Every structure is written in C-alpha cells, then in structure tokens.
Design a binder for this molecule. Structure first.
Ligand SMILES: COC(=O)c1cc(S(N)(=O)=O)c(Cl)cc1S(=O)(=O)c1ccccc1
Ligand code: NA
Ligand code: NA
Ligand code: NA
Ligand code: NA
Ligand SMILES: [Zn+2]
Length: 258
C-alpha cells in the first residue's frame, strides 16, 4: 500500500508515512503575486544547459524522468537566489486529467495544465543523495505549462512516451536539449520549500518562472496516455499526479522582477 495519487493513497495520506508532510517548509504553495516582494538584491538566473547530456527516460510509476549524466560539471544552474552551483540531474512533469488542473504551484490560485520541474543538486555536497539531506541541497526550476500552440522542443519527449507506457519501463534518450523547454523570460519567484513528492524532504530552493510555456492539446493528451500501473496490470491512466498547495507558514516569496 505505497504512496501515490488516489483517494486511498494520495497527498492527504502521505503524512502517515512521511510526517514531514505537515512541516514548516512544504511545497508546493500558492504564489500570491501581490504579496511577493520584489527583491532588488536577487540576481538574474544563470541557466547553462549547452553541454547537457541526457541518457534515458524512465516511467517511475508517478511520472516520467528524463535523466542526465551529472558525473561532470555540465548543465548547471547558478545565480538567481542561489549562492552556489547546482547540477542538473533530471526533469519531470506534473499534469492533470483536464487542462484546468495539473500544476503544483498556483499563481493567485490559478492552476496551470502542467508544471515542469528541472531538478538540480548543490555541488558543495558531492552528489545528490547527500544534497537532499541539506536545507540548501537542491534547486528546482519550475516552469508552468498552458495549452495553446505546440512546443516544438517538447515533441521528442512526447514521441518516446509510447515506449515507456507502464511503470518501470525505460528507453534510451540521448541528445535531448532542455533549452527547448524554457520560456523567453527568466523572471522568477523564489522561496524555500521541499520535494513535492515523498519523501517530502525540506531541501529545496524553489525558483518558479513567471512566464509559462505553451504546449499543444495533442502534446498534453499524450502525457495522459501514460500509466501509473505496470505492464500486465489493469490500466490506471497517469493523470493528476500533482500535490495541492500547502500552507506558506513562516515564509516569504520573493520576486526577481517589478
Ligand atoms: C520520488 O521523488 C520525486 O519524484 C522527486 C520530486 C521532486 S519535485 N517534484 O519536488 O521536483 C524532486 Cl526535487 C526530486 C525528486 S527525486 O529526485 O526523484 C527523489 C526521490 C527519492 C528521494 C529524494 C528525491
Ligand atoms: Na507584490
Ligand atoms: Na563522468
Ligand atoms: Na547520484
Ligand atoms: Na492550506
Ligand atoms: Zn516535481
């Protein structure tokens, strides 16, 4: 009886295996744009993805991960609110059963169709497993998706999904360039938070871009053909794999802009 996204094992249940679910810096949150304060001390974010090496794509039963080779200094995030270099290890998405839901963060209570998370770990901690044990171990760049015009740089991802339909399938996925997933503007909100999935560790500096990217209806429909079940089990479509907004508690959301 493992965690997932259903009434019997969804977000409202996670606290029994992971009591940090009711902690003081949980994610996601609603971003109240009128209360977020512009912080003129915040730096432009530096996203350096020119030498990113993707390796594989995996259906992990919750989402799908596009994995990167993080064994050298390639694909780093720095600047912004960060005081260190963070290396890209994977990205994944969260999305809905319909276009009106699917993001984890919300903006003045608005839900986007999906949310992309580019996960990076602080190189000062030597690898990912040590980083997640540190309050400044991870930096996640979060990008909202709305449905409209297709995102050409997403189609290679969307066309491999039929090969990883079910939990535990993986496929080779080399040469994927995550720069094709970024919006024009790097204006962002930032706040201290957590993983949005078990084990819910409070190790993440969140950096949420204001500008969504557009994907087509056909692209997001292919995400919703994935399955949470494994091969040979009754189909459970992989949809609504998002955790709702959590209490902001004693935190300030800072804006890089306005
Ligand atoms: C199962 O975990 C995930 O799905 C997940 C999700 C996030 S998210 N959704 O906060 O970006 C991050 Cl940062 C990182 C991860 S994760 O890197 O997959 C992970 C898994 C086990 C322990 C610690 C971290
Ligand atoms: Na404001
Ligand atoms: Na290496
Ligand atoms: Na690692
Ligand atoms: Na709440
Ligand atoms: Zn995520």
């Amino acid at each position: 009886h493992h965690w997932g996204y259903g009434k019997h094992n969804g977000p409202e249940h996670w606290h029994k295996d992971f009591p940090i679910a009711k902690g003081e810096r949980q994610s996601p949150v609603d971003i109240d744009t009128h209360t977020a304060k512009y912080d003129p001390s915040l730096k432009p974010l530096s996203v350096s993805y020119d030498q990113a090496t993707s390796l594989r794509i995996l259906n992990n039963g919750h989402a799908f991960n596009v994995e990167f080779d993080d064994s050298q200094d390639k694909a780093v995030l720095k600047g912004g609110p960060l005081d260190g270099t963070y290396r890209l290890i994977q990205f994944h998405f969260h999305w809905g059963s319909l276009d009106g839901q699917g993001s984890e963060h919300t903006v003045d209570k608005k839900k986007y169709a999906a949310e992309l998370h580019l996960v990076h770990w602080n190189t000062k901690y030597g690898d990912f497993g040590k980083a997640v044990q540190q309050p400044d171990g991870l930096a996640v760049l979060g990008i909202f998706l709305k449905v409209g015009s297709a995102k050409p740089g997403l189609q290679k991802v969307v066309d491999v999904l039929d090969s990883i339909k079910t939990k535990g399938k993986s496929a080779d996925f080399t040469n994927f360039d995550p720069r094709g997933l970024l919006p024009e503007s790097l204006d962002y909100w930032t706040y201290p938070g957590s993983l949005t999935t078990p084990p819910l560790l409070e190790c993440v500096t969140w950096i949420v871009l204001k500008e969504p990217i557009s994907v087509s209806s056909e692209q997001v429909l292919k995400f919703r053909k994935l399955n949470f079940n494994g091969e040979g089990e009754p189909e459970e479509l992989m949809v609504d794999n998002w955790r709702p907004a959590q209490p902001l508690k004693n935190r300030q959301i800072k804006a890089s802009f306005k």
